[PDB]
Structure 1
Amino acid sequence: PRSLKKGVFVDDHLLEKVLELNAKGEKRLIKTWSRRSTIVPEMVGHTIAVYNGKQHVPVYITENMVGHKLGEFAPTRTYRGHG
C-alpha cells in the first residue's frame, strides 16, 4: 500500500479540524475534499461530508472502518444496471 516506514496519512487541513471538534466535543458536518485521507480512530462517531466529484456525501464513521481511505464511502460512479 502506502509504505509503513512513512506515516499513516491525513491532509493536516482535515486532521486539525477533526481535533478542533475534540476540544469542544463533536459533532459537525465536515464538508471535505479529502478522499486522499485515512480514517482515524479520532474520526469515529463523526459524519464527514466526502466529495465524490459532484456531491459532498454524508458519511457516518464507525469502529470497523479505520484502515480505509475517505473516498471509499463516497463512491464515484452511478450505475443502476444495464438495460
Structure 2
Amino acid sequence: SLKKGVFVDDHLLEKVLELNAKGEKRLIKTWSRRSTIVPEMVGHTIAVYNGKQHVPVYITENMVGHKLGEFAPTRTYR
C-alpha cells in the first residue's frame, strides 16, 4: 500500500497550493482520483470524475490518508 510519498498528482497541488495564497473554490474539477488526500488541504470541495461526471465532495479532516475516488463511487444501486 506504499510508504515513500503519497503518489498524489502534480497538477493537483500546483492548483491547491497556489489556490491557498487566498482561495476559496468549489469549481475545482479533477480526473486524478488516484491521488492521496493530502494533510489538511481541506475546506475546498473537490469535484471528482467517476467516469461519467464530477462529484461535489466537500472534504473534512477525518478523511485524510484515503485516496480521492473512495468518495466518487463508480456504479449505481449497490
Please, what TM-score do these two structures have when normalized by structure 1? 0.83
Deviation at 1:31, TM superposition (A): 0.4
| Structure 2: distance between partners of 1:21 and 1:65 | 21
Q: Structure 2 unaligned runs (5+)? A: none
Query: What's the Cα RMSD here?
Result: 1.6
Superposed CA offset, 1:16-39 (max 9, x none): 101111112322321000111111
Q: Name the % identity.
A: 100
The range that moved more, 48-57 or 38-47, is: 38-47
User: Number of residue pairs matched?
Assistant: 78
| Structure 1: distance between partners of 2:45 and 2:37 | 12
CA contact (8 A) 1:50 1:59 kept: yes
Matched residue of 1:59: which SS? strand
Partner of 2:23: 25
CA contact (8 A) 1:18 1:42 kept: no
Superposed CA offset, 1:31-73 (max 9, x none): 0001111111242111000000001011000011001000011
Please, what TM-score do these two structures have when normalized by structure 2? 0.88
Structure with higher Rg: it is 1
